[PDB]
Design a binder for this molecule. Structure first.
Ligand SMILES: Nc1ncnc2c1ncn2[C@@H]1O[C@H](COP(=O)(O)OP(=O)(O)OP(=O)(O)O)[C@@H](O)[C@H]1O
Ligand SMILES: Nc1ncnc2c1ncn2[C@@H]1O[C@H](COP(=O)(O)OP(=O)(O)OP(=O)(O)O)[C@@H](O)[C@H]1O
Ligand SMILES: Nc1ncnc2c1ncn2[C@@H]1O[C@H](COP(=O)(O)OP(=O)(O)OP(=O)(O)O)[C@@H](O)[C@H]1O
Ligand SMILES: Nc1ncnc2c1ncn2[C@@H]1O[C@H](COP(=O)(O)OP(=O)(O)OP(=O)(O)O)[C@@H](O)[C@H]1O
Ligand SMILES: Nc1ncnc2c1ncn2[C@@H]1O[C@H](COP(=O)(O)OP(=O)(O)OP(=O)(O)O)[C@@H](O)[C@H]1O
Lengths: 362, 362, 362, 362, 362
DNA sequence: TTTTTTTT
């Protein structure tokens, strides 16, 4: 009897898998009886245990096929095709709404009964991030709106301050929240071509550590990044399309995505200042350092790195109307859960502890 | 029963799709019942909702096919083949009229009932453009004729001005009007061959912001572009065919298309000055800036960059006789629609606002 | 019922088509009923309307086929095979005799009933070229003999003169006449591998304004041209076969075609001077410039740079016996037609106008 | 019925055709009735007219096939396989006597009833060649034996002489005689590696006018030649096997063939100079120039380049016993034909005219 | 009836053929009746005549196959797979055992019934070899077993002594017995990086004459080699795996093979000295130079640098027990031959002639 | 697999 290529393609769509080998390997695991399957019983991986019982019959026949990689290629093509349709048709608001739904699904697992995470430790994360800058939650909301509208010239934000000011932490969490890539412009001009190629079809980009020149007056090591950026005015202003390249691929043409620039305290040309909507200053604060010393489960579990943490911050702080209408129903349910799990007193006690530089938990 | 490859080829032809993935992903959407298709019901994408009901039955059988990518490959070849045939057989005038017919079709949507655009905002853009240079509409007509005639050694226009003088803004609109590609020649000579490969079958090209050398006298940064360009005289001259290269592809041979060069105020070898038929200065002007500050919906919606804006300018200013015969019927209808919606006093009020540096509207 | 691959192959032979996409595109057009084919009715393209009615029946079945690119590939291979057989077995004189028949067929169309070309404008071009150098028609006959005889190390003609001397204009018309390729050697020395690979099976080649050195004294900025050419002395000399490369293709070994090099007046090593059997000096002459200004239809229709114009010159000036026997019949008919449609006094009126620098016509 | 791939492969073997396009084109000619075949009637090409009648029936069925290139690919591989088997199993003497049989077969045609060449002209070529250097036949006999005995570090001879001093003229004739390949050194080693791949299964090679250094004192521009030569000492010695490259096909390990190198008077490292038995070149004899200038059919028909002229020279000069045994029958047969058609006085008359530098065929 | 793919695969295994073209060509030869087969009658090649009669029936059907190259590709894979299994599985001792068997077969070739390598010229080579320096057969046996054991640190010998001293000559012969390569180090570090990759997968290696920096105090001209090697601590010791690299290719990781260093009388750091098991110095000798001058047949049939000339030297001197335990059979059989063929007096006469520096084959 | 990338 025949293999159903359709059931494979459906699994690939549902897992959103787009590596042929990863797709292949996982489907083969279903060939053993789901009824006895230790991976099912131990509830180890949702992309397995949700699916094993459904695909078992087809996996058994798949295991005898002689066409195995051919089946997988067509399946993976279907997933890649769906992505490109979406890229050309969705609004940036819908893109972000989809991205949020993905994170919310991961949170449902993380804090589920199977969930290994501790919602209390993750709320301790939110308390620390809310102390990193004044009006942190309002600042995030502004950044997101700026990315969604993608208004030309009004596109780019500058993070400034010394080593261990925290700027890379916040960049990483934002980059996880929205999706995107880091880029390093400190290179010589020739390699920048493939470097910028990374930006193709991304939502955000982040420029790391754009080294100035002459900051060595204050021990900052000098480099070319600032000059290179000043030579990229149209990529930043985003008013017109640019060509982009990848290794072994022909060029594509698109609006270069919005993003973030990060630096230590180099001097900035006025030509470059004009490019930026907003500059945010990061300054070392000892009470955060002493708090982290006593609350290091934050670092160990990478809580303060994660977009998941920022999403919890938005859920706790923002009015429901601020979210895209479709997901507002899920947001209410999470707000309800958090209101059940914590009183404001509990949360504010944590904020006080952080201000003391004491460990977050008491 | 079996897949009709013919119906897929029709869909590719009618959508003018030439990406195999986009074609695939699009066609797969039709497999669900159009009668419930929310994309149809919400009238979100014409390249969907026009076609779903027609293609539905074949899409269901296509969803079961084991050959899916081969079927799409043949369809995409047919669309590519038609472009090839046209490149060798249309007059340059006919090409331009086809291109115009497509923009006019897009304008029909944008200002339709489903049309989101405000014709008053788009007409405001024409006022700002007609201020950017003396006799602006005459300049556009002269450029269009030059591009149609494609007279050898009389093929290229040079734009000069300081930064923020509007040259790349104007180049963008012409390029969207005619269709074509931008190119960057401030490069090492080795990559340059794959760079020039982009010009294949294009109508225009634009060489963007070519760097001279010694312009640091004027504080200009310096680079290869001008010296690199003087090695390419025959590409400008267009008197003879040249050979063009793409990655993993053997060379094509054709005449290199006509176009535009933009730069800040470097000096130039007259071996290259001889190649330019015309040179246009651009100058910063305060009232444009002050007007634009109070008119930022122009920038937010990219109106000022977009070829639709130049087409609207021509329809307003130029006689019907100057358009090629077949489109004169549509041109007449659009002229009637514009005149119905705008008095000369309204248009002159807008122009007077721009001159005064108030926001365009009042 | 099934596709005749034989009928397709025959059309590719008939058209001498050798791009698979161009072949595919044009054969598809025959699917619609020739009974109403607007292209046929408008008599626009010979390669269509001559063939549509014959191929229509087979094109309808081709339109359904699943193999389409494969059928086209075999047809293109048959045309390519015919070219290789010919290149290995014809005398160079027969090759040229065939080329002349193809041009004469095009002239029969151009000045035929459809008659898109005015023979008066075309003859005005002949007067302009015959004025460009002394004894012009004698010089063309010398060049043809040289290319036919292909005497080793007596194989190349050098054109020198300042900008707008007309050297490219003459080279362009000659290249069209014989059929051949232009090539750029002002290039990085590695990429020459695939560049020169284009010369496979060609009859004649041209190198462009080849960037030398020493001319910096006169603002000729220098480059790899003369450097590279003084390497390839064997390619010029043609005493031995050389290996030529294409992408995804193993090398072809053959003797390298004769031809022409063009030069603004850089310096040349005498190892290279030894290899040009002849050099011609070209000079700007204002009265030609004044003539062109008033006679711009020459440039706009590209008349003066077409081998069609050179063929008309030879028909006017040379004895019938100088042509190969099989075409002497066609030559006689065109001599008669020319004598009918022009008196000598008209041609003398034209040539006088050219000398005066006024508009050629009066 | 169906195509006999066997009959196709026989033709490929008997033509020794080893290009798939050439073979394809050739065989398709046979599809017409040979009984009226104009080429047969003309006796135009032996590789056609000998075979048309035999292959006609199979060619008709071949003309309808859908596998045509695949059939030709298998046939071509049979021919290459035969070459590869000979390339290892035969002695260098056995190879050479095969080569001579092929040339003798051409001469039988060239002076045959078609007789398109006249042995008197070719004899005048012999006279010019034997006049070019003393005892030319004897120095050739030395070179032949050296190449058969193939002694390492003694596998190569050089010419270092001036331009237009004939070294290429002689190399061409020897290379035609031996059936080697020319190769080009003057390249980046990072691609020369592939070019050397052509040396697979060759009797002999020649390296061309290789760019040294220090020749700059006499305007010879320096380059990669000297560098790449003194690098490849293994190949120059003939020390060991090398894995020679091919595209889309495996590389092959085999020992490199012996050869010749030409240059003008560049530097040569003594580390290189060690590797050559003879390092000898020859310099202009102006009277010969005046002879050529009055005997130009010699050059026009390329007689003095062609290995056929050398073979005629050895037939005249050498003892029958100096040839390999089996061909000595044919050697005697041709010695008869020379002595039948020429007196010594005629040959001497040619040779004094040559030495006098005058036109020869008085 | 049908081609047995099995029989084709047997022949490939038995011949150890691993080029698809050779396999194809040779197997096709069997298609003629073996009963008359003149290659069999002449006993030209065992790879033919040993097999033809067995394979004949299958070869006939093979010649009619339409699939031929596909059969051969699978057969060649079988032989390559066999090598890769053994290459991974077996010991250095087993591998040398087989390398002996190969070279003992080349003795069975060279001194088989054709004797085209004269066993006694090869004895004169053995004489010149053993006369070269002290105790040479033992010095070989020692160095050989040293390289078989590959014991850490105990892995490198230093061949000092001047130009033409023979050190290069001998290493080449041992490399014939085992494979391997020589290596440069005389360069700045960026060169060394890629150069070190040459050692990858070598069963043995050597270093080219180290022009040691700091040898110029001895007036020995130099490059960086001494400081290079003195820094390369591990590579010599072979204590642990190291990484190796090539142009355009990824890194590989392996224990760096053992070997030899060659130099003239250069300066050495005592650290670098500690890396070597033996210090040796070679010198040119007046008897030996005048002997080869008088005995050049040893150069002509490639003897003195041949590994077989070492193999014969070992079969002469070394007892059967010193050879691989089963190959010892062949050792006895060649001992029988050589001891029968040559008296010790002719061997001693030959050695004495070398001791007189006079021609060996008196 | 070639190519492009890499290497320069
Ligand atoms: N505001 C802060 N005050 C004190 N310590 C901080 C602060 N922010 C971050 N840290 C400490 O700095 C460490 C590194 O943080 P992060 O990488 O975000 O800093 P950064 O300023 O972006 O650094 P860099 O510029 O070097 O990448 C954190 O793990 C934390 O220990
Ligand atoms: N003539 C002008 N006078 C004043 N402001 C101008 C003028 N032209 C453009 N602007 C302002 O400058 C911005 C940038 O315009 P644009 O990018 O076309 O300038 P440019 O000088 O042509 O740039 P570049 O040469 O770098 O491509 C516009 O969006 C507008 O805000
Ligand atoms: N002899 C001439 N006298 C005056 N004008 C000329 C002459 N020859 C050409 N022209 C003008 O010069 C233009 C360019 O001619 P052409 O390209 O053949 O010259 P060129 O010397 O080969 O130039 P370049 O070095 O730029 O390639 C022609 O289109 C014509 O307008
Ligand atoms: N000895 C000679 N006497 C007179 N003319 C000669 C002589 N040798 C060569 N020539 C002339 O030189 C022409 C070119 O010869 P050839 O190409 O063989 O020389 P070459 O030394 O190899 O030159 P190059 O290195 O420049 O290619 C010959 O066709 C002939 O006209
Ligand atoms: N000891 C010797 N006495 C005389 N001739 C020798 C001796 N050794 C080698 N030869 C001859 O000299 C040639 C070169 O020897 P070889 O290259 O092995 O010496 P080398 O000492 O390694 O030289 P170099 O240090 O110059 O690279 C050999 O091929 C052989 O013909």
């Amino acid at each position: 009897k025949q293999v159903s290529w359709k059931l494979v393609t459906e699994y690939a769509m549902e897992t959103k898998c787009d590596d042929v080998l990863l797709l292949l390997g996982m489907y083969l695991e279903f060939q053993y009886s789901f009824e006895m399957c230790l991976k099912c019983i131990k509830k180890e991986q949702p992309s397995h245990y949700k699916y094993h019982e459904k695909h078992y019959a087809n996996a058994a026949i798949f295991a005898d096929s002689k066409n195995q990689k051919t089946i997988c290629q067509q399946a993976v093509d279907t997933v890649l095709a769906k992505k490109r349709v979406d890229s050309l048709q969705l609004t940036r608001e819908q893109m972000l709404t989809n991205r949020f739904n993905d994170l919310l699904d991961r949170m449902d697992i993380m804090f589920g009964s199977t969930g290994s995470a501790d919602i209390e430790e993750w709320m301790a994360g939110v308390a620390w991030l809310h102390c990193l800058l004044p009006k942190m939650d309002s600042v995030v909301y502004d950044f997101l709106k700026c990315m969604v509208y993608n208004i030309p010239k009004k596109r780019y934000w500058l993070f400034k301050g010394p080593i261990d000011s925290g700027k890379t932490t916040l960049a990483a969490a934002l980059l996880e929240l929205c999706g995107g890539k880091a880029l390093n412009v400190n290179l010589p001009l020739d390699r920048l071509n493939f470097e910028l190629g990374v930006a193709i079809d991304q939502f955000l980009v982040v420029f790391e550590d754009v080294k100035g020149t002459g900051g060595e007056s204050r021990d900052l090591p000098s480099g070319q990044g600032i000059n290179n950026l000043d030579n990229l005015r149209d990529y930043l202003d985003g008013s017109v399309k640019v060509n982009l390249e990848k290794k072994h691929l022909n060029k594509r043409t698109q609006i270069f995505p919005p993003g973030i620039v990060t630096m230590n305290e180099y001097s900035v040309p006025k030509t470059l200042q004009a490019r930026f909507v907003k500059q945010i200053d990061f300054r070392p604060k000892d009470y955060l350092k002493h708090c982290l010393e006593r609350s290091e489960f934050l670092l160990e579990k990478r809580i303060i790195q994660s977009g998941i943490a920022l999403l919890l911050m938005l859920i706790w702080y923002r009015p429901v109307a601020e979210f895209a209408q479709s997901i507002q129903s899920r947001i209410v349910e999470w707000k309800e859960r958090l209101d059940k799990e914590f009183s404001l007193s509990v949360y504010q006690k944590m904020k006080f502890n952080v201000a003391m530089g004491i460990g977050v938990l008491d």
